[PDB]
Each structure stands twice: as C-alpha cells, then as structure tokens.
Design a binder for this molecule. Structure first.
Ligand SMILES: *[C@H]1[C@H](N)[C@H](CO)[C@H](O)[C@H](O)[C@H]1O
Ligand SMILES: *[C@H]1[C@H](N)[C@H](CO)[C@H](O)[C@H](O)[C@H]1O
Ligand code: NA
Ligand code: NA
Ligand code: NA
Ligand code: NA
Ligand code: NA
Ligand code: NA
Ligand code: NA
Ligand code: NA
Ligand code: NA
Lengths: 536, 533
C-alpha cells in the first residue's frame, strides 16, 4: 500500500488513503484516554458512531518519561486494537503545546525552565506557555517526534496511522508573544528574507515591516517555524500527512491576541503560517461555535486553494452533527467530533450534557449517509462538483418562544420559511433545499426541532446527480429559462455502490417524487436524472 | 382453479375467487415499493395487519424500459413471494396516467411529446397529462398491458393475481380537457352514436348535445374509451377482473373540473363512464376524506346496481379504519388502506403522521372481525341481507373541546351516536362509547372508532360482530300483544363452513344489549316473540 498523502490541485484537495481519496468520518477521544486501560471505553462508541477513523493523543510524557528512555507500549496496543476493529488512526502529538501549555511534556521538560524556557510577558511575569524561540525545546521535541515516527516506520507498514497532528492548539493565552530578552533580540532583528520574499514586502525589522501586527505575526511566525521543523524531521522518517489544529478566534468579534490563543493559525495569520511552514499539509479549525452563521464563516475562512478543509475538532452536542454536510460540500477531507468515549468526562457547556447512546446516535445518523459511498463521494469531491448544506436556522430559543400579534406571527413564519429555503446552482439545474415540512404537498417549511437537517449533492453528468439528505426536502428545477421546453424528473433511483458500480434497489416515483425528494432520519442514496423536453 | 370474476345480479355484486365470493381485506404499498428489494419492507406490515390481498404497482417503465424489450423480473419475484405467504395480489397498472401524469411511463414515452402528446390548455400552454386522443399512446399502452397479461396467463395459472387496476387516478388537473387542434377536431365533430343511444339523447356535436358539460363529458368519454380499449385487449389474453380508481371530487362541494381531476370517474360522469367503458368491471373510489358525512356520501354514490363497491384506496390514519364496516355493509367487495409499508414515507397530512405497529393495529383489529368468517360473510353479502355501520361522530375537535347547556350537548351527541337498522321482523340499535352494563347514554369512543356488522341468517336469526359498540335488538313492528326476548346468543366460529359453538352469551352479557370492545367475537343471535295469553 502507498503512503497516505494530501493532494492539492486546481483549487481542490484530497486525502489519499491506500491510493484513492478518503474522507475522515472521525471520532476523537477525551484528553485522558491515551492509555491501554482506557481503550475499552473508546471502541464501543466508535462502533456505535460508525466512524472510520479515530483521533487519539500520543503524549511526549508517555513515550519519553525519562530522557532517552522511550516507551511505545501504548502505541503498540493502540495499533493492534485499531487493526482488530478495521479502523484508521490520526495520532495527536501532545508535546511542546497542548492548548498553549506544556502539561503533556515529560516532567524533565516542563519543570526545567532554564533549559526549556517559557513565554515572558511585557511586564516581566511568566506564563506557562513554552517559547517558540527555545532551541533546546525544539531539539528535544523534534528528537522524540522522530522516535515516534521511527516506531511507525518499523511497526505500521500498512499505515493504520494515516495522519499526524503536530502539537495540539498551539499559541499563548495572556500575552501576544515572548517578551524575553532572547525573544526581543529576534524581534528587534531583520525579518527573515524568506518571509519578506514570499509576502513580497519591504525588508526591515519586525516592527518596521508589520507595525500594529508585529507582535502577533512574530509569535505566529516563530510557532510556525517550530512546528515546521518538527514536521520535517518526522516526515524524513515516514512521510505521512501532518497538520496543525487551531484554537479559533471568533471571526466576527475576535478580541485581542492573548484573549484568544496568540500565534496559532487564526484567520488573520494564515498567510504567515503558509509562508513559514511549507511542510505542514493543512491548518485545521477546531469548531466549538454552535451557531450556523459563525460555523459557516469559519468553514469559509479555512477552505482555500492552499488549504484543505479538515474539521479536526467539533463539539459532540446535537447541533453540531449537521455541520458534516457543509464540511463535505466545501470539499473537506474530514470531520472529528470530540469526546466520543465513556471515560466519565463531559466538557459541557462546550459539548453534550450527557454522553449516552442518544448523543452518539445524532452523529451515527449523518455518518450512515456517507459511509455507504465514502470512496465515491471522496473521488467526486476532489475531481468533480459537490455541494452540501445544513439547516440554516439554529433551534428556537426560550427567549424566542416567549415572543411567539396575529399579523406578526404570520410575518415571522414567512421570514422563517424563506430563511429555511436554500438554492444551489448545479449548472443546468438548481436544487432547492427546505427543512421541516411534510413528505406530501407544499406547506412551507418551519424547521426541524431541534435544527438538524442537511443535504449532499454530487454532479455525475450534465443532467445527473447523486443526492442524499437528512430531515429535508430537495427539489430540482431548471437553472435557466428553457426557451419553451418543459422539464421533469426523468428518473430517480435509490441504490448503492458495490465494488464501485451502482446497484439500483428501486425507482423513486409518484408520491415519492411529486413533492420534491423527502428525507427523514434514515439513509437513502439517490441518482437523479433531470430532463428538458419539447412540447412544440 | 376457476378464473376470478365479478358477478352482478339483482342489484348485488360479488368478487368470485376460486369459485366463491371473496372480500379483499387489503393492504396497498406506497408508490415506490414495486421492486424486489422493497418487498422485505411490505410483507411484515401485511402480516401484522392480517390482510389477504396486496395491491402493488406494476409500472410501464419497469416492464418496457426500452421499446419492445420487456422485463417481468419484478412480477416474477412478486408472484413467488406472495405465494410463499399465501396471499393474493391486485396489480396496479401505472402507465398513461398515474394521478393525471405520465411519470411511470417509460422515458421513450414520457420524453417524446411529438409521438405521445400532452393535453393542451385553452390558452395553448401544455400540461403534463397525456391526451386520451393520442392514438400512438393508446397503442403503446395496450401493447405493454397485453404483454403483462401474457405474463400472467403463462406464469400465474392458479391466479395469485385476482384483479388488475388499469391506470391509476386518470384525468387532468389544470384544464377540463385537451384543446389541441387534434382534440378540437373531435370535439367539433358528431358525438358517437353509441353514446347518444345509451344516454337516450338527440344526436349532435359535443357542445350541441351536452352544453355546459361538453368539455368535461368529452374528456371523461375520451379517457373512458382509452381505458376500455386497454382493458378489452388485456382481457382477451386473460379475462381477470379489471377496474379503475377515482381521484374523487368532494360530493358536497366539488368545485370545478380541473381543480379536481377532470375526466376521471367522478360522481357527475359515472353515467358517461358506464356507457363508454362496458368492459371495465367497476369504478372504485379513492377515499382520503376523513369526515363521516363525506365518506358516507362517497360510499352511497359509488354503490349502484351497475357498480360493485371497492374501496381501492383509503387513508391509513386511525379515523379511516371504521369505514370497513359501512363498506362491507353496502355489499362492498373489499377495502384497501394506502401506505402499508416500511419504506420510509408518509403522506401525512393525508395518512398517519407516524407509521408504526400502532398504525397497523388499528386496521388489524377490525380485519380480525371479518377474517374468521370471510367466505361466509362474502356469500351472505352477495346472496342475502347484510348491514354495516360506523361510529357517526368524528373525534371531537380541540376548539369544540375548548368550547363547552352541557346536559343538552350530551343529549344531542347521544341521539347522534345511536343508529337504527331495519332487519325485517327485528331492528337493531347500535350505540357507541358506553359501559357493558346498565343504560347510561352513549358518549362516543375517543378517538371515534366503533362499528358493527350484521347478516341475516333466517327470519329471526342474525350473525353479529361489532367493535367498541353496543348492539341491541327489538321488534321492528308492533307485536299485537306478544312480548319478545332474545332466545339464544351463541358465540362461535366457522370450521369447514359449519358453525361451531364456543359458548352461550346470557345474563349480564345480554341484559344490556350485546357489548363489544376491541376483541373479536362472532355471534349468532336468535330472537323470539312469545304469547302471554
Ligand atoms: C479542543 C477543545 N479545546 C477541547 C475542549 O474539551 C479539548 O481541549 C481538545 O484537546 C482541543 O484540541
Ligand atoms: C391515491 C392517493 N393520491 C395517494 C396519495 O398518497 C397515492 O398518490 C395513490 O397512488 C393514489 O392512487
Ligand atoms: Na446554472
Ligand atoms: Na442559473
Ligand atoms: Na437504500
Ligand atoms: Na432536453
Ligand atoms: Na357483495
Ligand atoms: Na322491518
Ligand atoms: Na319496522
Ligand atoms: Na370467539
Ligand atoms: Na313468535
């Protein structure tokens, strides 16, 4: 089997696994699940969820508890047990930074500030965040990362591990950058020529070149460099795809760096990160916003010709499940809900209040739409045209229920039906996606309670589309005036792929096609052929 | 075994299956279940329902996907699976019209308007409704139908398939008829003498003869002839019973043709359909009206000396189940609730919001009354006297609920929930929603659900079975000094056509009428007048 690789071409992207595009329909563990004993509490969720890929930490403290004394006993067991369950892995390298901090570095690292120095604030106080300009730190992290990758080269010939995250949520809370004498010496010095030439700027010192942004861009540049060097070193051993995951700032109202995690790949510093760390394959958003407007904005910012979309973290509460659809519609390579294990921890108010089969089942339901076509979908998304949408109104609040005049009620229902109707330009044909209405007749949509639906569409040919959707109606129509022809559905087939060949189960027709294509919680994969026809 | 056939004599009808009267206690699939892979989501509901007959589509598009290249692979599987389950079939031929439209016709038909022309409106816009004046369409439909019937003649010698529906809900929405120059040439022309003579009318052109009804009567005639032609051709091959099913207009407030599906067998054109299509066995209503008054009206209009009642489609929501009773009461040959499969579709608000075991059980409960006596009831319906009633108030509304003098409303609902049946020398009074003891007035079941069947066995003897109701017997006429009583009530079953007694109802079980809950009981009730001289 060939190595996994992130391919990029013509504004589009694919995670290759075993020589073809692949989608990560993932589960991520809680942060303390990276031990042999905890795996029994991980696997049952993954099976209930139907995930193909587990994201799980491998901690520097665990593999190198004493300096030079390595321990891959966790990695051994994890590999074997993944293989028994025929799932893949994304290993998360928790090392110099895990959520800005060194807690997962071995004690001989995190307790020796002299050797492995922290970020100093402008006021001279010290933050528990390791400086990207500590050369011993970089050397030490590199060396352990290399041993991990050596373990993979020796013991993972079939690439059970498909990708590695290098650090977890890098940056600094509480200051913009390192203000140490060591850091200040670099800040006062000329900006590296490499960055100047890539950005096509005038040479000068950090403050001369970037002004108001010098402190934050400096920290991003130094962090990116460090992560790049770590990545290069590991990939020299085994050239897996590697990525970084971002503690996002609010894209509409970020506040100041240091309120958010300064130096990470936030939307304002993506240009710095891409310039500085050409060996990092992509920069992944960690999504804990619940509201459709903010989530959608994040997906837009992180989907770039130079950046494959991977939702490396998202909340595991019900509202988050539907963001699978726009993720996949943007050509994303994967989606990884956080905290999908039974190790007795919930990060509520971020994720679900109660972790039970119902929590898992919200994701299982959407995953069951994609799993039966995963490779086909993956191919279409890289090489062709795909689309995807989620229900665009969040669930009605109690504040909103309380204020629910007879003419006012009517106007609001109208407003909401319009908001809950989405248009997709599919070339010669459009789709109209609507949420929360009967399977029969044309009563306006009123939304699902809770908000939950979505759809996937892939273009097979000029008049032919793959469609599957969830608690929604999909209706097709011409994209342009027909100049006197009529149109109809030629044929809608429900079916599946077997050995990459379409197998028809049944034809949808009559009531099933009179009123759009109506989907509940169950999985149906459709091929939809449209026709215009003359009546002259 | 002998061919199934519809008999009609002396104002009565029967569907003969295997040489004796038969009642269709049916189930009908949703519209996209006519494939091998879907049948696993059909059979379990049928079994939970206790249905004896499955109505399922056979689509023109599936049997002739490319012109002249026939494919009966579905019919094959369907026949074998039905026989394994020991049930019968009604095939629904979805061809030139399914609900006005050609969607089930093959691509080479529905995408070729030059060859197979659509209805043209008065303003020259075109509707997706195939014109009955399209002679290429009629020939093509006929040829494929003939091929289906050929398949049955060769491959169904035991008549698993007992009846065939020709098209599904014919007619046109959006226009009264085709106004294409081709159609206009016929409309301007003489009305066919055969129709003139059957209707005892003066000869003349369509507008001359029918005036304000010309447009609709023209479309009704032209669709009737088309359908009769397909029927005749298929019966030449194998003479099964064949019928058409009607997208009803509201009998009390129809609106205009084209608002409703113009040219179907609606109650105002039954006379045209009967004169134009003498080879179609019956015209069957499709019933989605929920309300007792309207359903009752529909049942009244479609049960005629020339028309056997078959409720070819009805909704599967709970209020519909009790309409089995008046359907059978009227001499109905069957009843076919729509949407009885697990293929993840509901037509709510027409049928049930949620399709589950509870949905099915509402029908299974009423079918359980009739299955144990199906052949005996079928016989008594054709060759004798039967009656059937449903609870005649619909479930109280939320705003009648938040309405509510109270003693007067209760007195009115009581009178309303009391039905009289004239059984010759004896009458029956059927009441709904009261205890099994004493005489407190009826208050209705919640939701509305009761009914009753009765068949006369001799002057003084009746077969009775009912559901969430009380049945009381009394003399029909004054007894001129005699008293009366129940002589004997026997609960039992038929075994090999013989009545087998289980027990005698008496004492409490007969002091207060004959009280039925949700469980099945079949009673033989013998009444007597007696002298006290
Ligand atoms: C993403 C996120 N902050 C969760 C919070 O529960 C967790 O800390 C993950 O490790 C982060 O990467
Ligand atoms: C009767 C009715 N219109 C239902 C609606 O779900 C369905 O279209 C059947 O095919 C019709 O015959
Ligand atoms: Na277009
Ligand atoms: Na367009
Ligand atoms: Na399927
Ligand atoms: Na065309
Ligand atoms: Na009869
Ligand atoms: Na009488
Ligand atoms: Na009388
Ligand atoms: Na009994
Ligand atoms: Na007597």
């Amino acid at each position: 089997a060939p190595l996994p690789e992130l391919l990029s071409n013509n504004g589009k992207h694919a995670l290759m696994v075993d020589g073809a595009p692949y989608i990560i329909l993932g589960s991520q563990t809680n942060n303390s699940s990276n031990y042999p004993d905890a795996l029994k509490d991980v696997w049952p969720s993954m099976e209930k969820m139907g995930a193909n890929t587990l994201s799980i930490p491998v901690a520097w403290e665990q593999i190198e508890p004493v300096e030079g004394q390595f321990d891959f006993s966790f990695v051994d067991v994890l590999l074997k047990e993944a293989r028994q369950r025929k799932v893949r892995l994304v290993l998360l390298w928790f090392a110099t930074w895990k959520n800005n901090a060194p807690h997962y570095a071995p004690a001989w690292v995190k307790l020796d500030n002299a050797r492995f120095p922290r970020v100093v604030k402008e006021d001279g106080d010290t933050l528990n965040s390791l400086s990207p300009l500590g050369q011993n730190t970089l050397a030490a992290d590199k060396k352990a990362f290399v041993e991990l990758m050596k373990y993979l080269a020796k013991r993972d010939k079939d690439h059970t591990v498909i990708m590695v995250q290098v650090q977890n949520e890098v940056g600094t809370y509480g200051a913009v950058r390192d203000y140490s004498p060591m850091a200040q010496a670099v800040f006062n010095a000329a900006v590296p020529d490499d960055l100047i030439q890539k950005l096509q700027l005038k040479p000068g010192t950090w403050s001369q070149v970037f002004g108001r942004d010098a402190d934050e861009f400096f920290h991003a540049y130094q962090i990116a460099r460090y992560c790049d060097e770590v990545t290069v070193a590991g990939k020299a051993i085994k050239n897996l795809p590697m990525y970084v995951n971002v503690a996002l700032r609010n894209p509409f109202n970020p506040g100041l760096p240091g309120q958010y995690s300064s130096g990470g790949g936030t939307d304002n510093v993506l240009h710095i990160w891409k310039a500085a760390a050409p060996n990092i394959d992509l920069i992944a958003p960690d999504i804990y916003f619940r509201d459709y407007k903010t989530v959608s904005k994040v997906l837009e910012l992180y989907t770039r010709p130079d950046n494959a979309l991977f939702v490396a973290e998202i909340g595991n509460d019900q509202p988050f499940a539907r963001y699978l659809f726009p993720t996949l519609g943007k050509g994303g390579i994967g989606f990884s809900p956080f905290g999908m294990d039974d190790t007795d921890y919930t990060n509520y108010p971020l994720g679900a209040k109660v972790y039970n089969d119902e929590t898992i089942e919200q994701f299982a339901q959407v995953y069951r739409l994609v799993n039966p076509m995963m490779r086909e979908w993956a191919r279409l998304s890289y090489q062709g045209q795909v689309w995807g949408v989620a229900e665009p109104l969040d669930s009605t609040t109690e504040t909103q229920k309380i204020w629910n005049t007879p003419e006012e009620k009517e106007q609001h229902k109208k407003d909401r039906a319009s908001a809950l109707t989405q248009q997709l330009d599919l070339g010669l044909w459009d789709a109209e996606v609507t949420y929360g209405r009967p399977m029969f007749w044309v009563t306006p949509p009123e939304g699902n309670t809770p908000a939950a639906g979505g759809a996937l569409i892939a273009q097979l040919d000029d008049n032919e589309y793959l469609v599957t959707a969830y608690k929604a109606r999909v209706e097709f129509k011409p994209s342009q005036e027909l100049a006197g022809k009529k149109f109809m559905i030629e044929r809608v087939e429900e079916g599946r792929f077997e050995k990459g060949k379409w197998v028809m189960e049944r034809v949808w027709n009559g009531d099933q096609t009179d009123w759009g294509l109506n989907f509940t919680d169950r999985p149906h994969l459709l091929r939809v052929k449209m026709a215009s026809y003359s009546v002259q």
